[PDB]
Structures are given as structure tokens and as C-alpha cells.
From Swiss-Prot, chains A, B, C, D:
Coiled-coil stretches noted in the UniProt entry, renumbered to this chain: none
Disease as annotated in the protein's UniProt record: Amyotrophic lateral sclerosis 10: A neurodegenerative disorder affecting upper motor neurons in the brain and lower motor neurons in the brain stem and spinal cord, resulting in fatal paralysis. Sensory abnormalities are absent. The pathologic hallmarks of the disease include pallor of the corticospinal tract due to loss of motor neurons, presence of ubiquitin-positive inclusions within surviving motor neurons, and deposition of pathologic aggregates. The etiology of amyotrophic lateral sclerosis is likely to be multifactorial, involving both genetic and environmental factors.
Region (Disordered): 60-79
Source species: Homo sapiens
Gene from which this protein is expressed: TARDBP
Effect of residue 6 to S: In ALS10; loss of ability to negatively regulate the expression of CDK6
Post-translational modification: Hyperphosphorylated in hippocampus, neocortex, and spinal cord from individuals affected with ALS and FTLDU. Phosphorylated upon cellular stress. Ubiquitinated in hippocampus, neocortex, and spinal cord from individuals affected with ALS and FTLDU.
Subunit structure as annotated in this protein's UniProt entry: Homodimer. Homooligomer (via its N-terminal domain). Interacts with BRDT. Binds specifically to pyrimidine-rich motifs of TAR DNA and to single stranded TG repeated sequences. Binds to RNA, specifically to UG repeated sequences with a minimum of six contiguous repeats. Interacts with ATXN2; the interaction is RNA-dependent. Interacts with MATR3. Interacts with UBQLN2. Interacts with HNRNPA2B1. Interacts with ZNF106. Interacts with CNOT7/CAF1. Interacts with CRY2.
Protein name: TAR DNA-binding protein 43
Length: 79, 79, 79, 79
């Protein structure tokens, strides 16, 4: 058949199984100064910046796309 | 058949199984100064910047794309 | 068949199995000064900057792409 | 068949199996001074900067690409 026949046996830990997320904290965070230009930051990445990715089985035909994001201008602006 | 026939046997640890994430912390964080230009940061990476990637089985035909992001300008701007 | 027939036998450790992530910490973090230009940082990398990548089985046909990101300018800007 | 028939036998260690990541710490971090230009840092690397890469089986046809990132200028900018 198609899909999954494998169980996940008994457990005792907090946050156990698939894709669980427990006590994330971003700190100072993210900070972009005036007139900074940053396109395509993690566009179509898989497990990036403090992240977790696990799989058991079949992964056929993955194309995740992010189109053009260049060509941006700040011209003659004041303060 | 197609997919997964392999179980995940009994466990005792916190945060066990597939892709779990426990106590991430970004610290100072991310900081971009005024007029800094940084395109395609981790565009289409796989497991980058403090990240975890595990797989058991078949991975056929993966093309994750991020299009053009160059050609950006800051011209004659003041303060 | 297609995919995975191999189980993950019983365990006792915290954070065991596939792609788990436990106690990451970014410290000072990331810091870009004024007028610094840095395109394609870890564009289409696989396991880069304190990262973990494990696989058991078949990996056929992987092309993860990140398009042009050059040609950026800061001209005559003040403060 | 296609994929994986090999199990991962019973274990006792914390953080055992595939691609697990435990107690990473970036320290001082990363620090770019004003008017520093650094394109293609770890563009399409495999296991770079304190990283771990393990595989058991078949790896056929891997082309991960990162396009042009040169030609950047800082001209006549003040402070």
C-alpha cells in the first residue's frame, strides 16, 4: 500500500514523536538598519537557522521555488 | 509498497523521535547596519546555521530554487 | 518496494532518533557593519556552520540552486 | 527494492541515530566591519565550519549550485 505502516512505540520524555517544538527563544531577535536591502533570506531553504528536520520513508519530487526579488533602489531620500 | 514499514521502538529521553527541537536560543540575534546589502543568505541551503537533518529511506528528485536577487542600489541618500 | 523497511530500535538517551536539535545557542550572533555587502552566504550549502546531516539509504538527483546575487552598489550616500 | 533495509539497533547514549545536534555555541559569533565585502561564503559547501556529515548507502547525481555574486561597489560614501 501507500503511506505508513510503522508505529511510534511507547515513550516517557516531554516533547517526543514528530516535529515537536519546546522552549524556543529569539533573544535580541532580528534587526535591519535604515537603507539595508536583503532579498531571498532563507528562500526555499530546508532546516535553516536553529531548526530540525527528520524523515523516515519516501520523498519523491520536491521543487519549492521563490521567484526573482532583486532590482530594488533607494534614490535621493533624506533622513 | 510505497513509504515506510519501519517503526520507532520505545524510548525514555525527552525530545526523541523525528525532527524535535528543544531549548534553541538566538543570543545577540542578527544585526544589519545601515546601507548593508546581503541577498541569498541561506537561499536553498539544507541544514545550515546550528541545524539538524536526518533521513532513513529514499530521496529522489529534489530541486529547491531561489531566483535572481542581485542588482540593488542606495544612491545619494542622506542620514 | 520504495522507501524504508529499517526500524529504529529502543533507546534511553535524550534527543535520539532523526534530526533532533537540543540546546543550540548563537552567542554574540551575527553582526554586519554599515556598507558591508555579503551575497550568497551558505547559498545551497549542505551541513554548514555548526550543523549535522545524517542519511541511511538512497539519495538520487539533488540540484538545489540559488540564482545571481552580485552587482550591488552604495554610491555617494552620507552618514 | 529502492531505499533502506538496514535498521539502527538499540542504544543508550544521548543524541544517537542520524543527524542529531547537542550543545552548539557560536561564542563571539560572526563580525563584519564597515565596507568589508565577502560573497560566496560556504556557497555549496558540504560539511564546513564545525559540522558533521555521515551517510550509509547510495548518493547518485548531486549538483547544488550558487550563481554569480561578484561585482559589488562602495563609491564616495561618507561616515
Amino acid at each position: 500500500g501507500f503511506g505508513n505502516q510503522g508505529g511510534f512505540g511507547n515513550s516517557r520524555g516531554g516533547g517526543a514523536g514528530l516535529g515537536n517544538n519546546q522552549g524556543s527563544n529569539m533573544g535580541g531577535g532580528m534587526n535591519f538598519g535604515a537603507f539595508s536591502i536583503n532579498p531571498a533570506m532563507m528562500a526555499a531553504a530546508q532546516a535553516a537557522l536553529q531548526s530540525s528536520w527528520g524523515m523516515m520513508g519516501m520523498l519523491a519530487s520536491q521543487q519549492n521555488q521563490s521567484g526573482p526579488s532583486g532590482n530594488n533602489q533607494n534614490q535621493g531620500n533624506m533622513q
